[PDB]
Write an enzyme that holds these catalytic residues in place. Structure first.
Site, PDB file in Angstrom:
ATOM      1  N   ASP A 189      27.607 -39.076 -17.229  1.00 56.54           N
ATOM      2  CA  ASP A 189      29.032 -39.044 -16.980  1.00 56.54           C
ATOM      3  C   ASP A 189      29.492 -40.458 -16.565  1.00 56.54           C
ATOM      4  O   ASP A 189      29.430 -40.826 -15.381  1.00 56.54           O
ATOM      5  CB  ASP A 189      29.171 -38.096 -15.780  1.00 56.54           C
ATOM      6  CG  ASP A 189      30.625 -38.053 -15.311  1.00 56.54           C
ATOM      7  OD1 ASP A 189      31.560 -38.463 -16.005  1.00 56.54           O
ATOM      8  OD2 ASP A 189      30.806 -37.500 -14.118  1.00 56.54           O
ATOM      9  N   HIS A 345      26.233 -46.117  -9.668  1.00 53.40           N
ATOM     10  CA  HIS A 345      26.176 -46.494 -11.113  1.00 53.40           C
ATOM     11  C   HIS A 345      26.355 -48.007 -11.203  1.00 53.40           C
ATOM     12  O   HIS A 345      26.904 -48.574 -10.203  1.00 53.40           O
ATOM     13  CB  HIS A 345      27.399 -45.919 -11.873  1.00 53.40           C
ATOM     14  CG  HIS A 345      27.080 -44.661 -12.588  1.00 53.40           C
ATOM     15  ND1 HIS A 345      26.306 -44.672 -13.733  1.00 53.40           N
ATOM     16  CD2 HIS A 345      27.421 -43.387 -12.273  1.00 53.40           C
ATOM     17  CE1 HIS A 345      26.217 -43.394 -14.144  1.00 53.40           C
ATOM     18  NE2 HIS A 345      26.881 -42.599 -13.291  1.00 53.40           N
ATOM     19  N   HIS A 379      22.188 -42.995 -13.609  1.00 54.37           N
ATOM     20  CA  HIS A 379      21.015 -42.090 -13.863  1.00 54.37           C
ATOM     21  C   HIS A 379      20.107 -42.770 -14.907  1.00 54.37           C
ATOM     22  O   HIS A 379      19.995 -42.302 -16.032  1.00 54.37           O
ATOM     23  CB  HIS A 379      21.434 -40.715 -14.401  1.00 54.37           C
ATOM     24  CG  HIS A 379      22.369 -39.932 -13.492  1.00 54.37           C
ATOM     25  ND1 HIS A 379      21.920 -39.321 -12.270  1.00 54.37           N
ATOM     26  CD2 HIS A 379      23.728 -39.688 -13.615  1.00 54.37           C
ATOM     27  CE1 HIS A 379      23.025 -38.712 -11.706  1.00 54.37           C
ATOM     28  NE2 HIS A 379      24.144 -38.910 -12.503  1.00 54.37           N
ATOM     29  N   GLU A 404      19.429 -37.982 -19.955  1.00 54.04           N
ATOM     30  CA  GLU A 404      20.440 -37.011 -19.542  1.00 54.04           C
ATOM     31  C   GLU A 404      21.004 -36.352 -20.826  1.00 54.04           C
ATOM     32  O   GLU A 404      21.463 -37.055 -21.740  1.00 54.04           O
ATOM     33  CB  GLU A 404      21.595 -37.563 -18.677  1.00 54.04           C
ATOM     34  CG  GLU A 404      22.737 -36.519 -18.673  1.00 54.04           C
ATOM     35  CD  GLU A 404      23.707 -36.720 -17.530  1.00 54.04           C
ATOM     36  OE1 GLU A 404      23.538 -37.546 -16.656  1.00 54.04           O
ATOM     37  OE2 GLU A 404      24.609 -35.785 -17.485  1.00 54.04           O
ATOM     38  N   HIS A 406      23.189 -33.596 -20.867  1.00 56.65           N
ATOM     39  CA  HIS A 406      24.080 -32.602 -20.293  1.00 56.65           C
ATOM     40  C   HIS A 406      24.880 -31.770 -21.301  1.00 56.65           C
ATOM     41  O   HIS A 406      25.132 -30.556 -21.088  1.00 56.65           O
ATOM     42  CB  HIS A 406      25.035 -33.373 -19.343  1.00 56.65           C
ATOM     43  CG  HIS A 406      25.671 -32.540 -18.277  1.00 56.65           C
ATOM     44  ND1 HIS A 406      26.220 -33.147 -17.155  1.00 56.65           N
ATOM     45  CD2 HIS A 406      25.802 -31.133 -18.133  1.00 56.65           C
ATOM     46  CE1 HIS A 406      26.713 -32.155 -16.375  1.00 56.65           C
ATOM     47  NE2 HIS A 406      26.460 -30.937 -16.914  1.00 56.65           N
ATOM     48  N   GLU A 449      20.472 -33.828 -15.245  1.00 58.95           N
ATOM     49  CA  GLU A 449      21.236 -32.872 -16.001  1.00 58.95           C
ATOM     50  C   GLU A 449      20.737 -32.674 -17.439  1.00 58.95           C
ATOM     51  O   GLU A 449      21.461 -32.925 -18.397  1.00 58.95           O
ATOM     52  CB  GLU A 449      22.742 -33.296 -15.899  1.00 58.95           C
ATOM     53  CG  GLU A 449      23.258 -33.083 -14.456  1.00 58.95           C
ATOM     54  CD  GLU A 449      24.714 -33.467 -14.264  1.00 58.95           C
ATOM     55  OE1 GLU A 449      25.223 -34.436 -14.772  1.00 58.95           O
ATOM     56  OE2 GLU A 449      25.398 -32.552 -13.624  1.00 58.95           O
ATOM     57  N   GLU A 525      22.883 -35.130  -5.052  1.00 57.21           N
ATOM     58  CA  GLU A 525      24.305 -35.459  -5.117  1.00 57.21           C
ATOM     59  C   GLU A 525      24.994 -34.461  -4.221  1.00 57.21           C
ATOM     60  O   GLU A 525      24.640 -33.259  -4.231  1.00 57.21           O
ATOM     61  CB  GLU A 525      24.954 -35.232  -6.523  1.00 57.21           C
ATOM     62  CG  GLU A 525      24.192 -36.035  -7.592  1.00 57.21           C
ATOM     63  CD  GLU A 525      24.622 -35.917  -9.048  1.00 57.21           C
ATOM     64  OE1 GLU A 525      23.954 -36.397 -10.006  1.00 57.21           O
ATOM     65  OE2 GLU A 525      25.820 -35.376  -9.146  1.00 57.21           O
ATOM     66  N   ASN A 585      38.702 -37.164 -23.698  1.00 57.72           N
ATOM     67  CA  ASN A 585      38.305 -37.946 -22.513  1.00 57.72           C
ATOM     68  C   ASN A 585      38.343 -37.058 -21.251  1.00 57.72           C
ATOM     69  O   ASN A 585      38.891 -35.960 -21.281  1.00 57.72           O
ATOM     70  CB  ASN A 585      39.214 -39.141 -22.317  1.00 57.72           C
ATOM     71  CG  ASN A 585      40.623 -38.700 -21.957  1.00 57.72           C
ATOM     72  OD1 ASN A 585      41.496 -38.677 -22.849  1.00 57.72           O
ATOM     73  ND2 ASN A 585      40.807 -38.275 -20.713  1.00 57.72           N
ATOM     74  N   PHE A 589      38.068 -38.235 -13.841  1.00 59.54           N
ATOM     75  CA  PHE A 589      36.752 -37.851 -13.344  1.00 59.54           C
ATOM     76  C   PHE A 589      35.758 -39.016 -13.278  1.00 59.54           C
ATOM     77  O   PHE A 589      34.684 -38.887 -12.711  1.00 59.54           O
ATOM     78  CB  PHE A 589      36.115 -36.631 -14.095  1.00 59.54           C
ATOM     79  CG  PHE A 589      36.583 -35.343 -13.424  1.00 59.54           C
ATOM     80  CD1 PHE A 589      37.707 -34.668 -13.893  1.00 59.54           C
ATOM     81  CD2 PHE A 589      35.922 -34.799 -12.324  1.00 59.54           C
ATOM     82  CE1 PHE A 589      38.162 -33.484 -13.308  1.00 59.54           C
ATOM     83  CE2 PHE A 589      36.376 -33.633 -11.711  1.00 59.54           C
ATOM     84  CZ  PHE A 589      37.503 -32.970 -12.195  1.00 59.54           C
ATOM     85  N   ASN A 592      34.994 -41.505  -8.705  1.00 56.43           N
ATOM     86  CA  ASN A 592      34.495 -40.622  -7.618  1.00 56.43           C
ATOM     87  C   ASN A 592      33.926 -41.406  -6.439  1.00 56.43           C
ATOM     88  O   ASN A 592      33.138 -40.858  -5.632  1.00 56.43           O
ATOM     89  CB  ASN A 592      33.253 -39.822  -8.164  1.00 56.43           C
ATOM     90  CG  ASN A 592      33.431 -39.241  -9.561  1.00 56.43           C
ATOM     91  OD1 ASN A 592      32.473 -39.200 -10.356  1.00 56.43           O
ATOM     92  ND2 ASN A 592      34.631 -38.704  -9.855  1.00 56.43           N
TER      93      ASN A 592
HETATM   94  C1  LIG Z   1      32.640 -31.068 -13.671  1.00 57.65           C
HETATM   95  C2  LIG Z   1      31.295 -30.349 -13.380  1.00 57.65           C
HETATM   96  C3  LIG Z   1      31.389 -29.032 -14.145  1.00 57.65           C
HETATM   97  S1  LIG Z   1      29.746 -31.293 -13.865  1.00 57.65           S
HETATM   98  C4  LIG Z   1      29.789 -32.554 -12.595  1.00 57.65           C
HETATM   99  O1  LIG Z   1      30.759 -33.512 -12.919  1.00 57.65           O
HETATM  100  C5  LIG Z   1      30.764 -34.549 -11.899  1.00 57.65           C
HETATM  101  C6  LIG Z   1      31.996 -35.328 -12.334  1.00 57.65           C
HETATM  102  O2  LIG Z   1      32.053 -36.538 -11.538  1.00 57.65           O
HETATM  103  C7  LIG Z   1      29.428 -35.293 -11.825  1.00 57.65           C
HETATM  104  O3  LIG Z   1      29.205 -35.913 -13.092  1.00 57.65           O
HETATM  105  C8  LIG Z   1      28.321 -34.274 -11.591  1.00 57.65           C
HETATM  106  O4  LIG Z   1      27.051 -34.919 -11.624  1.00 57.65           O
HETATM  107  C9  LIG Z   1      28.409 -33.210 -12.671  1.00 57.65           C
HETATM  108  O5  LIG Z   1      27.508 -32.162 -12.290  1.00 57.65           O
HETATM  109 MG   LIG Z   2      26.237 -35.162 -16.390  1.00 59.44          MG
HETATM  110 NA    NA Z   3      32.292 -38.485 -12.517  1.00 63.47          NA
END
Ligand SMILES: CC(C)S[C@@H]1O[C@H](CO)[C@H](O)[C@H](O)[C@H]1O
Ligand SMILES: [Mg+2]
Ligand code: NA
Ligand SMILES: [Mg+2]
Ligand code: NA
Ligand code: NA
Ligand code: NA
Ligand code: NA
EC number: 3.2.1.23
Lengths: 1011, 204
Positions: A189, A345, A379, A404, A406, A449, A525, A585, A589, A592
Site C-alpha cells: 500500500d 516506508h 514492507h 506482498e 494483498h 499481507e 501495525e 486510486n 489512504f 497515515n
Molecule cells: C483498508 C483495510 C481494509 S487494509 C489496511 O489498509 C491500511 C491503509 O493504510 C494499511 O495498508 C494496512 O496495512 C492494511 O491492512
Molecule cells: Mg497491503
Molecule cells: Na495506507
C-alpha cells in the site's frame, strides 16, 4: 524471452548476494570505515528516455545515445521527473490480475550512462556493477553487449562487468520495465513508481577474494563473556599460503585477533569446505549493544598471504547482543523488551522513493526524540545505509522481505502455490544474505499481507536453520500461524474482539491466553495515524505495561506519503491518490503518518512520545516515586524539574538529580509549599530533562513529563455588588439587552443571540447556535465513498439520520427581568423528516456586570446515532492575533487523545490553533478548558473548543488543505462535550464506547464576558 | 451547611428561589451546592442542582437531597429500575418498568444495618400525594440514614415518625470484590468534580 512475464526467471547472470563490501586494500581504512578507492559511485547525471512498451525501444539505443533523451539525475523515480504518473492504490493491484502476465503497454525507462574506467581496474581483478534498487525489473547492456537481468525492486542486483569494459570510456544501457511478474509480489500500500531509485556503484575486488563473511556473537549466562565467530568464504584460486585474519576493535584498541589458513572442519562423508574458514575470538566483559547504549566494535576481515602481503580487507560494525524468546518473552541480552516501534516506508515528498542520508538521519533523530526505540521496514528491505544508521544511533529493526500479494483472491493464492516458491525464496534468502551481520536487525519478517501459504512455512524454516540468532515473524493468515515466532497482529484492539472468520483479530489481552498459546505478542501495525487520529493510544500502552507478554508494537505509520505538486502559479501543494490522474486510486489512504511528508509533526506524535516515556511516576503526599523502564542504562543524563502552579500562576519549582538504575525506583521528597494565596486548583508538573546533548538530542531535551492535581480551593466568596443594572428592550422580532457600552440582541423568530455590540462595534458575523456535528475526520469516514457508501461508517450514520441536515425549530423564547439581571429562556427541537433528534434548552442571564451566563441542557434521542459533539458555534467579527487559554495544551488534544497535554495557561498565535491536515476535517480542539481569551472576549466554564479561520462547513466541503481560504472573522466552536476521534483502525468504527456521547441528557454552562 | 445566598424573584409565570450553600470542615470547603427552585402556575416545583466537589476531598458517597415526609403511605410506585434494590455497580438484573410495592419492601433488612433499598435510573416516583420526576436514584423508608449508621443490629431499628426520602442525582458504587479494602471501581466513584441533576416535585 519476455523474461518479465515468467516467475521462473528472476534474474540472468546475477552474482550471489553478500553483506556490504568495499574491497579496501588498506586495513586501516577498513578499520575506520573510510571511503574505499575500490568502491565508486556512478550516481549523478545519466541519459533517459521514456517508452510506452519494451517493443518500442530502438535497437540503436544499445550502441548510441538517443538524441531525444534527456539528461537526468540518478537515482530517481521517473514519475518524479513527470514522464508518467505515479499511482496510489492500496489493495487492488494497479494492473489486471492475470499472473504472470502484465499489460502490453508497460512503461519502459531507458537509462544510459557514458563513464570512464581506470586501466588499473581492468589489468587485474574483477569489476562488477551494483544496482541497489531498480523498480521493477531490467535488462542491462555494456558497450552494446548484453550482460544480464534482474528482479526484486528492493535488494541490490550485481553483474560482473570484467569482460565487457574497456579502459577509458564505456556506455551502459539499462532497460527498466515498470511492470513484471515481480509486480505480483510487490503489492504494498504505497505509491506505485519505477526507475533506478537507489544507488549505482562499481566495485573492484581481486581475483582471489572474500566472497562472503558471517559474524556471530554468543555469550555466557551473565553476558560477561562472549565468543565472536566469523565464517569467511573465498572465491578464486586456493593456495596454501593464503590466510585469513579477523581482528576486532573497540575504538582504537584492538581487543582480539585470530589468523588461519583456509579449510573448514569436516562437514560430511565428503569432507569440509576447502574454501572457507571460521575464526573464533574470545571477548571478556564485552560492551553490549542495545537501543539504549549502542556500543559497537569493528571487525576487520583480512585476506592475505602468509608472508603478510594484504590481498584485500572487508569489515563491519559488530554489536554484541543476544536475541532469544524464552518462557514466552522476547529478550534482548537477557531482558524483556518493550517495543516502542513505528512502521516506516522510504518516502520523500520531492524525490518519491529515493532515500538520502540527510532524510534518514532526520527520521532517526525525530524517532529517538519521541521515545521510539524500534522500526519495522514496511514492507521490503531498505536502502543499505539505513541499517548502518540504526546500528550506530541504536534502533531495534524488523527487516522484512519484499513480498506482498494483498490483492490476490484469496490472499494466499500465490504464496501457497509451489510455482511461486522460487521467486519468493530469493526475496527472503537474498535479504538474509545481505543483512545478517547488522546488530540492529533483531527480527526477520517473511513479508506482509500475502495470506499464509506453504511457501511461508518453508521459508520460515529456511531462516530458522540458517540464522538461529533472530526470531522470525509473519502476520499473514491470522497472525499466529506456524510461520511466526511472535503473535504479531495488525490492528487487533486492546479489549475488543473482532472475530472475523478464519482470521479473527482477538483482543490482544485475550489472544495471549488462548488455549495452548504461549508466544509473546507484538503488534506489527497498530494505532492507524491517519489524519486526526491516535484516539485510544494510551489504552495500548497501559496494557503493554501491565502484561508481561504484551511486548509493544509498531505504529502505522511514520510519515504521510503525500507528494508535492505545483499549482498553475508554481506554488507547491501536498497531493494524494488520484491527484495525478491515477485511477483507480485510494485517495488519502496513503497518508497515515505521525509526521507530514516534510517531517513536521502531526499533533499525535506528542501523544506517542508521552505514552512511550521510559520513566514512570507516582505521587504520595509530597513524595514523587520515579521508576525507570530502561533495561540497561542508569539515568546518567537526566534530572527532574518540578513546578507547582495555581491556575497557571507559578508558585514553587525546583530540580533534582535523577539517579535511577535500570528497572529501579528513586524517591524524591518535595519541599513544603507556601499554599495558594486564594482559590483555585494547584497543579504539580514534573519533567525529566537531559542536561547534556547526545548523538540524537540537544542539551535540555525533555524526555518525559507528568502532572497531578494537588490541593484545590473552591471559591466561596461572592463577587462585590455592581450598582449597574442591565435593561431589557422588547420588540416583536427581538429582545434586547443593554448595559452601558454593551448590548445583546436575541432574535425572536430564531431564538438565537444574533448580535452583540461593544460600543458601536458589532461582534458577530453569524448568530450563536447549537452545533451537533463535525467536519468528518478520516476515522469518521473510513472507506466510505460517494459511489460506494459504507453504511457502518460514523459519517454515513450521522448523514443518514439527518444530523447534517436537521433544522432548528423554535419551541420557546421568553424574556424575564430579575432583580439585577435579564433572563432569556429558549428551547429548540432539531428534526429530520418527522423525527426529533435533539432538544436544546438554555437560559442566558445578563447581570449588572455585563457577564452573560449561558446554561445548556440538551436531550439526544436514544435511537439516533451518538452525535459528534454537543456545543455552540458562531462566527466572530474580530480576528485577533493570539489565543490564550487555561486548559489542556498547548497542542491540539481530543477526549481519547489528551494524555500528553498539560493543564496550564497557554498562549499562541491564532494560526497554531489550526492543524493543517492534508485532507481537511475538524481539528485543533483543546479540551479541559476553564478559560478562553480572544480579543476583547472571555469565556469561562469547563469545555472543549476550537478557534480558526475555517467554518466546519468549509472543512467538510474541502478535500485538500491548500484549497482552504480564511473566511472573514473567526469561527469559534465551544463544546460542552466532544466525541473521541478513534484510530484503532481507519476502516471501521473505532471510537471506544466510553468516548461516544451516549448519555441521552447533557448539561454544560458557560460565562461569556468582555474585558 | 453555610448559606452563601438565598434570593427570591418573581417571573412572569412563576416564582424563582435561588440558593447557594457551602459545606466546610475545619475551614476547608468540601462541597458547594447551587440551586434554583422554580414554582409555576401549575403547582409544579422544578429544582435544578449544581454541585461542586473539591478534587482533594475523598469522593463522596452520594450527591442528593433528603427530607423526612410527614406522610406515611402503604405503597411506593415508580417508573425506573426494579423491582428489587439496585446500586450503580449492581443493577444489571433490575429491569426498567413501572413497579409498585408495599413500603416495607423498599427497605432491605441487612442484619448489620446500612444504607439500603436504593433503586436507580428512575424517572418517576410516587408516594402518597407526592410525585417526583427526573432521572435519579432513591431510597424510601421509615429509618433515617443517621439511625442506620448508629444501629448495629436490625432488630434494634425503630420506625421513625414519617418517611425518610433520600433522592440522589448520583450514588457511589457499593463494591464487594472483597470486604476488607476499598473495592469500588474508579468508574463508580463520584470523581467528576461537578455534578448536575434536576428534579420536579408536584402533588397527585
Ligand atoms: C483498508 C483495510 C481494509 S487494509 C489496511 O489498509 C491500511 C491503509 O493504510 C494499511 O495498508 C494496512 O496495512 C492494511 O491492512
Ligand atoms: Mg497491503
Ligand atoms: Na495506507
Ligand atoms: Mg520474471
Ligand atoms: Na509487556
Ligand atoms: Na542523572
Ligand atoms: Na474535508
Ligand atoms: Na449501622
Amino acid at each position: 524471452r519476455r523474461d518479465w512475464e515468467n516467475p521462473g526467471v528472476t534474474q540472468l547472470n546475477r552474482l550471489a548476494a553478500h553483506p556490504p563490501f568495499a574491497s579496501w586494500r588498506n586495513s586501516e581504512e577498513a578499520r575506520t570505515d573510510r571511503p574505499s578507492q575500490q568502491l565508486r559511485s556512478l550516481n549523478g547525471e545519466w541519459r533517459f528516455a521514456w517508452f510506452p512498451a519494451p517493443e518500442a525501444v530502438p535497437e540503436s539505443w544499445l550502441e548510441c545515445d538517443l538524441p531525444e533523451a534527456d539528461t537526468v539525475v540518478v537515482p530517481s523515480n521517473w514519475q518524479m521527473h513527470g514522464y508518467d504518473a505515479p499511482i496510489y492504490t492500496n489493495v487492488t493491484y494497479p494492473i489486471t490480475v492475470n499472473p504472470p502476465f502484465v499489460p502490453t503497454e508497460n512503461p519502459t525507462g531507458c537509462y544510459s550512462l557514458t563513464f570512464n574506467v581506470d586501466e588499473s581496474w581492468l589489468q587485474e581483478g574483477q569489476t562488477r556493477i551494483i544496482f541497489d534498487g531498480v523498480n521493477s525489473a531490467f535488462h542491462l547492456w555494456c558497450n552494446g553487449r548484453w550482460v544480464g537481468y534482474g528482479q526484486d525492486s528492493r535488494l541490490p542486483s550485481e553483474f560482473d562487468l570484467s569482460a565487457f569494459l574497456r579502459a577509458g570510456e564505456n556506455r551502459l544501457a539499462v532497460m527498466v520495465l515498470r511492470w513484471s511478474d515481480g509486480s505480483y509480489l510487490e503489492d504494498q500500500d504505497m505509491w506505485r513508481m519505477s526507475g533506478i531509485f537507489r544507488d549505482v556503484s562499481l566495485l573492484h575486488k581481486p581475483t582471489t577474494q572474500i566472497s562472503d563473511f558471517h559474524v556471530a556473537t554468543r555469550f555466557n549466562d551473565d553476558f560477561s563473556r562472549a565468543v565472536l565467530e566469523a565464517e569467511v568464504q573465498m572465491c578464486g584460486e586456493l593456495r596454501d599460503y593464503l590466510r585469513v585474519t579477523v581482528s576486532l576493535w573497540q575504538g582504537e584498541t584492538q581487543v582480539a585477533s585470530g589468523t588461519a589458513p583456509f579449510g573448514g572442519e569436516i562437514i560430511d562423508e565428503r569432507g569440509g569446505y576447502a574454501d572457507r574458514v571460521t575464526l573464533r575470538l574470545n571477548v571478556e566483559n564485552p560492551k553490549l549493544w542495545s537501543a539504549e547504549i549502542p556500543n559497537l566494535y569493528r571487525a576487520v576481515v583480512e585476506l592475505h598471504t602468509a608472508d603478510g602481503t594484504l590481498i584485500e580487507a572487508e569489515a563491519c560494525d559488530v554489536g554484541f547482543r543476544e536475541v532469544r524468546i524464552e518462557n514466552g518473552l522476547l529478550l534482548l541480552n537477557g531482558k524483556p523488551l518493550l517495543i516502542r516501534g513505528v512502521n516506516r516506508h522510504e518516502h520523500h515528498p520531492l524525490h518519491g522513493q529515493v532515500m538520502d542520508e540527510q532524510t534518514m538521519v532526520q527520521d532517526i533523530l525525530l524517532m529517538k526524540q519521541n521515545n521510539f526505540n524500534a522500526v519495522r521496514c514496511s514492507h521490503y528491505p531498505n536502502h543499505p545505509l539505513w541499517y548502518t544508521l540504526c546500528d550506530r544511533y541504536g534502533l531495534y529493526v524488523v527487516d522484512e522481505a519484499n513480498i506482498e500479494t494483498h490483492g490476490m483472491v484469496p490472499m494466499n493464492r500465490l504464496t501457497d502455490d509451489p510455482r511461486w516458491l522460487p521467486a519468493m525464496s530469493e526475496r527472503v534468502t537474498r535479504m538474509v544474505q545481505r543483512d545478517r551481520n547488522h546488530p540492529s536487525v533483531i527480527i526477520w519478517s517473511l513479508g506482509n499481507e500475502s495470506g499464509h501459504g506453504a511457501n511461508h512455512d518453508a521459508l520460515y524454516r529456511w531462516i530458522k536453520s540458517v540464522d538461529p540468532s533472530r526470531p522470525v515473524q509473519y502476520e499473514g493468515g491470522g497472525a499466529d500461524t506456524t510461520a511466526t515466532d511472535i503473535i504479531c497482529p495488525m490492528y487487533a484492539r486492546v479489549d475488543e474482539d473482532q472475530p472475523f472468520p478464519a482470521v479473527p483479530k482477538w483482543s490482544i489481552k485475550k489472544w495471549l491466553s488462548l488455549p495452548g498459546e504461549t508466544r509473546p505478542l507484538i503488534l506489527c501495525e497498530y494505532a492507524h495515524a491517519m489524519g486526526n487520529s491516535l484516539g485510544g493510544f494510551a489504552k495500548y500502552w497501559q496494557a503493554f505495561r501491565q502484561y508481561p507478554r504484551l511486548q509493544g508494537g509498531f505504529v502505522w505509520d511514520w510519515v504521510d506519503q503525500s507528494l508535492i505538486k505545483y499549482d498553475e502559479n508554481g506554488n507547491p501543494w501536498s497531493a494524494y491518490g488520484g491527484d495525478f490522474g491515477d485511477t483507480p486510486n485510494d485517495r488519502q489512504f496513503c497518508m497515515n503518518g505521525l509526521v507530514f511528508a516534510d517531517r513536521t509533526p502531526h499533533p499525535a506524535l506528542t501523544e506517542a512520545k508521552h505514552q512511550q516515556q521510559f520513566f514512570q511516576f507516582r505521587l504520595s503526599g509530597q513524595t514523587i516515586e520515579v521508576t525507570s523502564e530502561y533495561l540497561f542504562r542508569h539515568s546518567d543524563n537526566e534530572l527532574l524539574h518540578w513546578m507547582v502552579a495555581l491556575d497557571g500562576k507559578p508558585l514553587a519549582s525546583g530540580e533534582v538529580p535523577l539517579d535511577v538504575a535500570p528497572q529501579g525506583k528513586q524517591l524524591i521528597e518535595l519541599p513544603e509549599l507556601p499554599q495558594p494565596e486564594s482559590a483555585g486548583q494547584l497543579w504539580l508538573t514534573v519533567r525529566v530533562v537531559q542536561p547534556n546533548a547526545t548523538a540524537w538530542s540537544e542539551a535540555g531535551h525533555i524526555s518525559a513529563w507528568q502532572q497531578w492535581r494537588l490541593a484545590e480551593n473552591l471559591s466561596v466568596t461572592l463577587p462585590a455588588a455592581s450598582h449597574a443594572i442591565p435593561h431589557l428592550t422588547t420588540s416583536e422580532m427581538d429582545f434586547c439587552i443593554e448595559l452601558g457600552n454593551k448590548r445583546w440582541q436575541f432574535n425572536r423568530q430564531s431564538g438565537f443571540l444574533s448580535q452583540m455590540w461593544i460600543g458601536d462595534k458589532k461582534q458577530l458575523l453569524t448568530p450563536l447556535r447549537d452545533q451537533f456535528t463535525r467536519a468528518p475526520l478520516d476515522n469518521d469516514i473510513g472507506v466510505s465513498e460517494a459511489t460506494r457508501i459504507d453504511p457502518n461508517a460514523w459519517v454515513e450514520r450521522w448523514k443518514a439520520a439527518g444530523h447534517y441536515q436537521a433544522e432548528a425549530a423554535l419551541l420557546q423564547c421568553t424574556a424575564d427581568t430579575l432583580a439585577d439581571a435579564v433572563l432569556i429562556t429558549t428551547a429548540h427541537a432539531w428534526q429530520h423528516q418527522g423525527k426529533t433528534l435533539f432538544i436544546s434548552r438554555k437560559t442566558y442571564r445578563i447581570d449588572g456586570s455585563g457577564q452573560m451566563a449561558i446554561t445548556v441542557d440538551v436531550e439526544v434521542a436514544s435511537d439516533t446515532p451518538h452525535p459528534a459533539r454537543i456545543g455552540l458555534n458562531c462566527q466572530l467579527a474580530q480576528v485577533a492575533e493570539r489565543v490564550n487559554w487555561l486548559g489542556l495544551g498547548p497542542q491540539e488534544n481530543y477526549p481519547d487523545r489528551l494524555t500528553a497535554a498539560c493543564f496550564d495557561r497557554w498562549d499562541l498565535p491564532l494560526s497554531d490553533m489550526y492543524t493543517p491536515y492534508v485532507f481537511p476535517s475538524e481539528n485543533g480542539l483543546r479540551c479541559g478548558t476553564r478559560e478562553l481569551n480572544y480579543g476583547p472576549h472571555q469565556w469561562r466554564g469547563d469545555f472543549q473548543f476550537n478557534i480558526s479561520r475555517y467554518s466546519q462547513q468549509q472543512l467538510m466541503e474541502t478535500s485538500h488543505r491548500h484549497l482552504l481560504h480564511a473566511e472573514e472573522g473567526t469561527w469559534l466552536n465551544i463544546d460542552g462535550f466532544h466525541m473521541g476521534i478513534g484510530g484503532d483502525d481507519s476502516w471501521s468504527p473505532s471510537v471506544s464506547a466510553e468516548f461516544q456521547l451516549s448519555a441521552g441528557r447533557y448539561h454544560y454552562q458557560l460565562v461569556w464576558c468582555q474585558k
